[PDB]
Amino acid sequence: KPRIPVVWIHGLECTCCTESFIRSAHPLAKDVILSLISLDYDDTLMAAAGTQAEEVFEDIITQYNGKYILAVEGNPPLGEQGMFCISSGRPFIEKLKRAAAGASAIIAWGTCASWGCVQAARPNPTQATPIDKVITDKPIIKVPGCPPIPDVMSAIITYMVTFDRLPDVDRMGRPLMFYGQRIHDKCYRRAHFDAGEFVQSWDDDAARKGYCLYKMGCKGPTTYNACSSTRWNDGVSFCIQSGHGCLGCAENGFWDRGSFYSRVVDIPQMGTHSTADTVGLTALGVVAAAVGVHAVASAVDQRR
C-alpha cells in the first residue's frame, strides 16, 4: 500500500529534465506523484526551503536507508573544490555522495547526469563530470537526452514500479526499450535518405516535401533514442519532423562532435534513385555526344 520513496537531487543543471518529466501525458505527472511513487524530496517542487528542506532530506535518507530510489538531474563540478555548485553552504558533490550511499539504485536523468551535457563541453570550465564517474558502487540507469522524452521518463518509472525491477540495459547503462535502436533506423524520412533525396538549404523545394535532413548535418544515423518512434509531447512531433536535423542530444559528448550542421562521418550513403539517375544521364550523355552533340530543346516538356 505505501508508495516507493524517491529522492530527487539537482547538480549543475538547466532544469530541462524536471521540466520534461512533468510534460508526461501517460501516466500524468500528477498521477505519478500522487499514486505511483512518493516523491519525498525535489528542490524544484517541494514546500520546504532552507533548514526545513535540509531536515526533510536528512530525515528521508535516514529513515529509508537502503530502501529509496535516487533520481539525479544535472552533474557535480570538481573545479574550485566543487564550489561551482554550492548546496547548504557545502559542495554539491557531498550531498550527492551522501544521498547515493543510502540509495538502492540511481536514475541518472538526461545527458547531464549520464554523460556531462553542455556544462561539460569544450573547455569544461567547471570540470563537470557525469554521475557514473563519481558514484561507482551503485547501479545507475542512464536515461540520456537533452531532455529525454517525457513519456519515456514516465514509462521507465512505470516499468520499474509495475515490474518491480530495473530495466534491461546496454553496455552503456541505457534502458534497452528506448535506447536500443538509432533514430536513423526508425526515421519516417528514411525513404528519402534511401533514395538520395535531401534537403539542401532550409525551406527549399526538398524541405517542403519533407526530404531527408542528412545533408543538413542530421545526426540520427549515430544517435540512440526513441524520438522517431515514440516522438515528443504526446506523439506530436520531433526534431526531424519539424524540419531540423537530429543534434544527437542523447549521445555522449555530442556538443563536441563538430558543427550540428555538417554531414556526419562514416555512415554508408548510396542513393537508389540518385545513383540510377546519374547512371542514366551519364549514359544518355555518352550517346548524346556520339550521335547528336547535346540537347538544345524548345518545349522542354511538351506532353499536354
Partner: protein, 581 residues
C-alpha cells in the same frame, strides 16, 4: 557589524543572522541570508547564486549557427528564450533579415513560453506560499463549490469534484508520506486563505500541473520538441506546405489545426483558472500590496519584446514596450540602448569573478567571464560556508547596472513601464485589476503586485498567441509561405569581423545576448539574463539588487520559518541557472 545607507535603505548586519539554503520552488541553486532585529524585521539581505557552468566560456570558437543550441541549454524552465536571443544576435551581427512567417512563428514560440512558464510558476512553484495545502482537508466541498462558482465560469466546480480532490489528498497524506508537502510551513499565521479557498487552490494546482503539458505542443509543432526546441539563424526550420504534393513532410493544414486548438484551450484555461485565482489570492492576502516593494518604486527596466514588423526592433514595432525608469520618476520613461557602453554594465567586485580593475563596470561587448571562487573570511571554511561575507565576494551572479542604477526587471517592471508609457491596453488592464481589489495603483509595487502582473501577462500572452496565429494564417491565405532566409547561411558570405546584440523579454525580465564574430568563429559571447539583474550582488557603491531590496523591512512572524522570505523571493520568479549560465 557595520551599517550604511543606500537607496533610502539602512543596511544593518547586526542582530541574529538567518540562513535559507537551499531556496526551493525555484529554478537552480540559490542561497539567501538575512539579519533581523528585536522586532523581527529584516535589516540586511544577502542574495547569492550557488551555481555556475560557464556558457560564455564554452561558446568561444564555435560556429555562430551552432550557438542557439548551446545557449538554449542555459535554462530548461525558460526553455527557448535563449535560443531566440541567440539567433537574434547572430542575425544582428551577420546582417541577416528573416522572412515574415519566421518572425510570426518565433513570436508564437515566445508567447507560448510566456503562457506556459507563468502558469507553472503561479501554481507549482509560488502557489504553496499562499495556499495552505493541508488546510484543504478542513474545507466543506459544497462551500468550495459555491466559492469557485462565484469567481469563475470555469466548468470544473461540482461539490463532488472538490470532494474527490479532498479525498485523494486525504488518501495521500493518510499514509504518513506527505512527499512534497513534508515538513512544509502549513499553519503559519501568514497563511490567510480560508479552508474552502485552500481546497479550491489545491484542486487548481493539480489541474494546472496537468494542463501545462498541452501548451507546449505548440512548441512541438514548430520547434519539434519541448523542452529545448530547435531553431536556425535565418528564420525557422519548420518549412510550410499547405496545398502541394508532400505536405505530409511539412507544416500543413492539420498541423496548424492542432496549434489552433491549443491556443483556444490555453487562453480559456488561463482566463478562467489562473486569472481568477490570482485575483482571489489578492483578495485574501491584501496587506501584501504594501510588503516587499523593493526597487519597484524607484528603478525598473524593460528592453522590449515581440517585434510585430519583421526585423524591426524599433519602438513602433515591439508589442511589449521597452524603457527604463530611475529615481521613481515614472513620468519620464528613458530610452534604452544596448550598444551604448554607458548604459548596460556589469560589476563583479562582489561576485566570484576576476577583472583587470574590479572597481569599474564592463559593458557586455567588453565582458569578461573569468571564474574565481573566493569567499574570504566566512567564519567556517572554503568548503563550508556557514555565513557569507557580504562585505566582499559572495555570489556566482555578476552585478549588472543600467547607467550605474540598480534595476528591477520582470513582469512588474514591464507593467509599470508599459503603463506609464501610455499603452492603451495596459492602462485598462491595470486600472480594472486594481479597482476590482479596491486597492490604489501603488498597491501593484509589491510582492503581491509581482504575482498579479505575472497572471495579467499570461492573459496578455495567450491573447497575443491568437493574434500571431491569425497573422501567420493571413500570410498563408495570401500565398506567402517562406520560413527561412539562406543568402548568408554560408560563412564565406559573412563579414570577416562583426558583432551583434540579441534582445527580448524572457518570462522573468530583460534578456540580452552580445556576440562577436571573427573568421566564422565566435570571438566573444556575453549574456545578461533577467535573474542576473534581480538577484544581483552589491556593486562598488554598495547599492543593492532588486531581491535584497524587496526583502528589507519585511516583518517575520516566525524567524526559523522563513515564509515571508520565500513569498517575496518567489514573487520575482527566481531562475538561477539563467542568472549564472
Amino acid at each position: 557589524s557595520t551599517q550604511y545607507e543606500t537607496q533610502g535603505y539602512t543596511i544593518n548586519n547586526a542582530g541574529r543572522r538567518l540562513v535559507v539554503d537551499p531556496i526551493t520552488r525555484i529554478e537552480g541553486h540559490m542561497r539567501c541570508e538575512v539579519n533581523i532585529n528585536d522586532q523581527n524585521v529584516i535589516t540586511n539581505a544577502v542574495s547569492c547564486g550557488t551555481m555556475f557552468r560557464g556558457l560564455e566560456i564554452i561558446l568561444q570558437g564555435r560556429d555562430p549557427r551552432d550557438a542557439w543550441a548551446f545557449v538554449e541549454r542555459i535554462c530548461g524552465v525558460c526553455t527557448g528564450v535563449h535560443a531566440l536571443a541567440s539567433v537574434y544576435a547572430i542575425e544582428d551581427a551577420i546582417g541577416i533579415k528573416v522572412p515574415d512567417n519566421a518572425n510570426i512563428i518565433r513570436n508564437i514560440m515566445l508567447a507560448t513560453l510566456w503562457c506556459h512558464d507563468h502558469l507553472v510558476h503561479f501554481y507549482q512553484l509560488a502557489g504553496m506560499d499562499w495556499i495552505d495545502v493541508l488546510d484543504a482537508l478542513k474545507a466543506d466541498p459544497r462551500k468550495t463549490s459555491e466559492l469557485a462558482q462565484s469567481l469563475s465560469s470555469w466548468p470544473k466546480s461540482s461539490p463532488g469534484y472538490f470532494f474527490d480532490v479532498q479525498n485523494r489528498l486525504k488518501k495521500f497524506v493518510e499514509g504518513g508520506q506527505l512527499g512534497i508537502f513534508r515538513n512544509g510551513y502549513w499553519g503559519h499565521p501568514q497563511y490567510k486563505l480560508p479552508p474552502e479557498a485552500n481546497l479550491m487552490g489545491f484542486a487548481h494546482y493539480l489541474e494546472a500541473l496537468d494542463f501545462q503539458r498541452e501548451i507546449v505542443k505548440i512548441h512541438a509543432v514548430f520547434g519539434g520538441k519541448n523542452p529545448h526546441p530547435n531553431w536556425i539563424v535565418g528564420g525557422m526550420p519548420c518549412a510550410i506546405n499547405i496545398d502541394e504534393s508532400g505536405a505530409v513532410g511539412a507544416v500543413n493544414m492539420e498541423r496548424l489545426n492542432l496549434v489552433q486548438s491549443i491556443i483556444t484551450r490555453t487562453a480559456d484555461f488561463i482566463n478562467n483558472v489562473m486569472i481568477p485565482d490570482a485575483l482571489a489570492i489578492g483578495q485574501f492576502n491584501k496587506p501584501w500590496s504594501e510588503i516587499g516593494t523593493g526597487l519597484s518604486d524607484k528603478c525598473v527596466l524593460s528592453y522590449g519584446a515581440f517585434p510585430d514588423i519583421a526585423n524591426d526592433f524599433g519602438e513602433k514595432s515591439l508589442l511589449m514596450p521597452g524603457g527604463a525608469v530611475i529615481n521613481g520618476d515614472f513620468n519620464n520613461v528613458l530610452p534604452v540602448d544596448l550598444v551604448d557602453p554607458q548604459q548596460v554594465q556589469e560589476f563583479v567586485d562582489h561576485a566570484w569573478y576576476r577583472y583587470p580593475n574590479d572597481q569599474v563596470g564592463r559593458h557586455p561587448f567588453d565582458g569578461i567571464t573569468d571564474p574565481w571562487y573566493n569567499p574570504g573570511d566566512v567564519k567556517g571554511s572554503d568548503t563550508n560556508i556557514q555565513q557569507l561575507n557580504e562585505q566582499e565576494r559572495y555570489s556566482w551572479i555578476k552585478a549588472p547596472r543600467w547607467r550605474g542604477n540598480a534595476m528591477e526587471v520582470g513582469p512588474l517592471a514591464r507593467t509599470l513601464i508599459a503603463y506609464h508609457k501610455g499603452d492603451a491596453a495596459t492602462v485598462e488592464s491595470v486600472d480594472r485589476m486594481m479597482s476590482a481589489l479596491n486597492l490604489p495603483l501603488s498597491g501593484i509595487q509589491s510582492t503581491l503586485g509581482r504575482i498579479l502582473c505575472r497572471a495579467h501577462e499570461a492573459q496578455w500572452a495567450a491573447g497575443k498567441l491568437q493574434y500571431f496565429f491569425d497573422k501567420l494564417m493571413t500570410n498563408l491565405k495570401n500565398g506567402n509561405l517562406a520560413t527561412a532566409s539562406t543568402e548568408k547561411w554560408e560563412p564565406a558570405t559573412w563579414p570577416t569581423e562583426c558583432r551583434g546584440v540579441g534582445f527580448t523579454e524572457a518570462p522573468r525580465g530583460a534578456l540580452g545576448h552580445w556576440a562577436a564574430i571573427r573568421d566564422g568563429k565566435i570571438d566573444l559571447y556575453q549574456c545578461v539574463v533577467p535573474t542576473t539583474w534581480n538577484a544581483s550582488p552589491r556593486d562598488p557603491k554598495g547599492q543593492i539588487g532588486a531581491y535584497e531590496a524587496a526583502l528589507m523591512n519585511t516583518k517575520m512572524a516566525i524567524p526559523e520559518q522563513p515564509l515571508e522570505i520565500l513569498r517575496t523571493l518567489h514573487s520575482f520568479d527566481p531562475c538561477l541557472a539563467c542568472s549564472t549560465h
